[PDB]
């Protein structure tokens, strides 16, 4: 999980993704790929072999041909990199990558996370807060805020 | 598309296409690379610490340690 290593790879991604404008498409490619990577019986086999060509070919081969030429030459980069083993991490990055542009999500307050796409901190946020009306759900909230205020409280008891 | 687990079948399919090659047995492997009588070493994964390892030109081979990824023999 170097994953920081992602960037030069990961970075050119968005750019190619930007340039190639695939991100719908490229996004597809990534979905497909992480899928491919996931394959465990394959995985045992996956570090098996020395010849990079062999893997580009075989991997690309059973793949179901979701591949792109830019992603062929480039996949050839990751294998030539030999680093390719860990690739799926980038999708996470890619997510943020995709996310980066214009996105937003949410952290559950005490219940469940809206992940609302709201780009104004504490504003678009506030918009969601007010937007409750989702005010209904408990979902452990009370134990949480009462226990957390209670936590600041006993914290002061200690302070007392 | 493959959505859930149709991928697996796709995988199966994807596999099935290329499927043939995969896996091996404990006691079964191949010595990948070596120098100096010590070998990058593969297969036969579960074995007792330092069991005697039949060699071709038969002999046992001295077993140093079990690395997680792969190990080599003495």
Could you provide a short overview of the structure?
Chain A has 160 residues and is mainly alpha-helical.
Topology of this structure?
The structure is cut from a larger assembly and holds chains A (160 residues) and B (74 residues).
Chain A: H1 6-20, H2 24-37, H3 40-46, H4 52-62, H5 69-81, H6 89-101, H7 124-130, H8 141-159
Helix pairs in contact in A: 1-6, 4-5
Chain B: H1 6-18, E1 31-35, E2 38-41, E3 71-73
Antiparallel strand pairs in B: 1-2, 2-3
What does this structure look like?
Chain A: InterPro entries: ATP_synth_OSCP/delta_N_sf, ATPase_OSCP/d_CS, ATPase_OSCP/dsu. Chain A: Keywords: ATP synthesis, Cell inner membrane, Cell membrane, CF(1), Hydrogen ion transport, Ion transport, Membrane, Transport. Chain A: It is a peripheral membrane protein. The structure is cut from a larger assembly and holds chains A (160 residues) and B (74 residues). Chain A has 160 residues and is mostly helical. Chain A has a domain at 3-101: Peroxidase, domain 1 (Orthogonal Bundle). Helices cover 62% and strands 0% of the residues of chain A. Chain A has eight helices and no strands. In chain A, α1 (6-20) packs across α6 and α4 packs across α5. Chain A is elongated. By secondary structure, chain B is α+β, with helices and mostly antiparallel strands. Chain B has one helix and three strands. In chain B, strands 1-2-3 form a three-stranded antiparallel sheet, with no helix packed on it. In chain B, a hairpin with a 2-residue loop joins β1 (31-35) and β2 (38-41). Chain B is elongated, with a radius of gyration of 17 Å. The chains are: A mainly alpha (160), B alpha+beta (74). Chain A binds chain B through residues 35-36, 39, 41-42, 44-45, 47, 50, 58, 61-64, and chain B through 2, 7, 10-11, 13-15, 17-19, 21-23, 32, 69.
């Amino acid at each position: 999980e170097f994953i920081t290593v992602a960037r030069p790879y990961a970075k050119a991604a968005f750019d190619f993704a930007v340039e190639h404008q695939s991100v719908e498409r490229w996004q597809d490619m990534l979905a497909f790929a992480a899928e491919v990577t996931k394959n465990e019986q394959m995985a045992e086999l996956l570090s098996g072999a020395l010849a990079p060509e062999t893997l580009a070919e075989s991997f690309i081969a059973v793949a179901g041909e979701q591949l792109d030429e830019n992603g062929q030459n480039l996949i050839r980069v990751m294998a030539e990199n030999g680093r390719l083993n860990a690739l799926p991490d980038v999708l996470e990055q890619f997510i943020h990558l995709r996310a980066v542009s214009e996105a937003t999500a949410e952290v559950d307050v005490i219940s469940a996370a809206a992940l609302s796409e709201q780009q104004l901190a504490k504003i678009s946020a506030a918009m969601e807060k007010r937007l409750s009306r989702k005010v209904k759900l408990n979902a452990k909230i009370d134990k949480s805020v009462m226990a957390g205020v209670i936590i600041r409280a006993g914290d002061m008891v200690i302070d007392g | 598309m493959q959505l859930n687990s149709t991928e697996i079948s796709e995988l199966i399919k994807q596999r099935i296409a290329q499927f043939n090659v995969v896996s091996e047995a404990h006691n079964e492997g191949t010595i990948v690379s070596v120098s100096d009588g010590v070998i990058r070493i593969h297969g036969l994964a579960d074995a007792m610490q330092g069991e005697m390892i039949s060699l071709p030109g038969n002999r046992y081979a001295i077993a140093l340690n079990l690395e997680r990824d792969s190990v080599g023999a003495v």
